[PDB]
């Protein structure tokens, strides 16, 4: 899951 | 309810990880609010007619700092409103936010700081949580570091968020190992500790101060979420907590009779009175807030919608939700803060947009 929209 | 009267945006365009209204402002004076991304932290008044007066910034003289966490605090002698941030250079500053000076600054996590939060009753004691998997507890009136809340049984992977509980008895802490953990900070070793910190000038003795090196939680749980649990609150006896999966879990330590404070370290089970579900809230490090009295819970999510629960009901699964959507606020909301009398929303955005909604 990541932090930031890519 | 809420209608959005204003936004603006920051020059830099990075993302604002977060916003807290100052709640120690003094009677009569503007309301005003904190907002900290890029290696800067900058301070806004509230007006009328929807005016957010742009005040004043701190800029790290590190380009490669990112400040992502701030809280405020007073000074306990005078009385004045301080403001702490941190972030990836693991420093905390401690910033007057007339000037914005950095009074002083802390180092030990050296490590990315993911929250700050100060003690409910007492202004001078700061909680850090870091990407080192600690907890760190600081006395910012001696400038000592009181404890480390750490070792195997600690977390093992980054801590993102804590909350002290209303008294400032015990801590719950949270982070990417999935789990969530109680460390109570009312035991004789802990009361001691502070006292014995209070007591602590360096200038009259020629000791180190000594740290609590604290490591086994006063319980823990990996059986509320299943991914990285990213923002904790205690709600009374109970606790808010939630993950990167679309939902704010409110649960307890132990059985659904079992007193908080008879919960023992081999607890193993928990109780789940309600989950809040929402949608588009996938990625992590995504923070709710609640107002000064705890009535109500703001969320954004990752495409710019707000959700508000009222939890003024009998029981924590009845809360009544309430969504606010503007068709020009589209990016992620990473968090949100109330003003002290409850008049003011503020969401800060992914974009460095913030957003102001009023009652």
Redesign the interface.
């Known amino acids: 899951?990541?932090?930031?929209?890519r | 309810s809420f209608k959005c009267v204003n936004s603006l945006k920051e020059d830099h365009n990075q993302p604002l990880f977060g916003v807290q209204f100052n709640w120690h402002s003094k009677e009569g004076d503007p309301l005003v609010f904190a907002t900290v991304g890029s290696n800067r932290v900058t301070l806004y008044e509230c007006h009328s007619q929807g005016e957010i007066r742009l005040l004043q910034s701190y800029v790290d003289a590190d380009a490669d700092e990112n400040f992502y966490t701030c809280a405020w605090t007073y000074d306990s002698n005078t009385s004045h409103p301080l403001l702490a941030v941190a972030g990836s250079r693991g420093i905390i500053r401690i910033i007057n936010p007339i000037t914005m000076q950095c009074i002083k600054h802390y180092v030990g996590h050296g490590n990315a700081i993911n929250e700050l939060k100060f003690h409910p009753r007492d202004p001078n004691l700061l909680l850090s949580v870091s990407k080192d998997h600690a907890l760190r507890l600081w006395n910012i009136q001696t400038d000592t570091l009181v404890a480390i809340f750490g070792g195997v049984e600690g977390h093992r992977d980054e801590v993102l968020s804590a909350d002290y509980d209303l008294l400032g008895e015990k801590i719950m802490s949270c982070g990417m190992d999935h789990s969530l953990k109680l460390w109570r900070i009312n035991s004789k070793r802990m009361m001691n500790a502070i006292k014995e910190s209070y007591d602590y000038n360096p200038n009259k003795t020629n000791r180190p101060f000594i740290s609590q090196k604290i490591h086994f939680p006063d319980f823990s749980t990996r059986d509320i979420h299943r991914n990285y649990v990213d923002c904790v609150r205690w709600l009374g006896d109970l606790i808010l907590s939630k993950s990167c999966e679309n939902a704010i879990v409110c649960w307890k330590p132990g059985k659904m009779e079992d007193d908080i404070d008879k919960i023992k370290p081999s607890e193993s089970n928990v109780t789940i009175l309600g989950r809040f579900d929402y949608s588009q809230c996938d990625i992590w490090y995504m923070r709710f807030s609640m107002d000064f009295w705890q009535k109500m819970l703001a969320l954004g999510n990752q495409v710019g919608k707000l959700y508000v629960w009222d939890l003024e009901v009998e029981d924590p699964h009845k809360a009544k939700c309430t969504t606010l959507t503007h068709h020009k606020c589209g990016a992620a909301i990473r968090q949100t803060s109330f003003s002290r009398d409850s008049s003011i929303l503020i969401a800060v955005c992914d974009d460095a947009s913030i957003w102001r909604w009023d009652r």
Request: zero cysteines; hydrophobic letters at 40%.
């Open positions: 899951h990541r932090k930031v929209l």
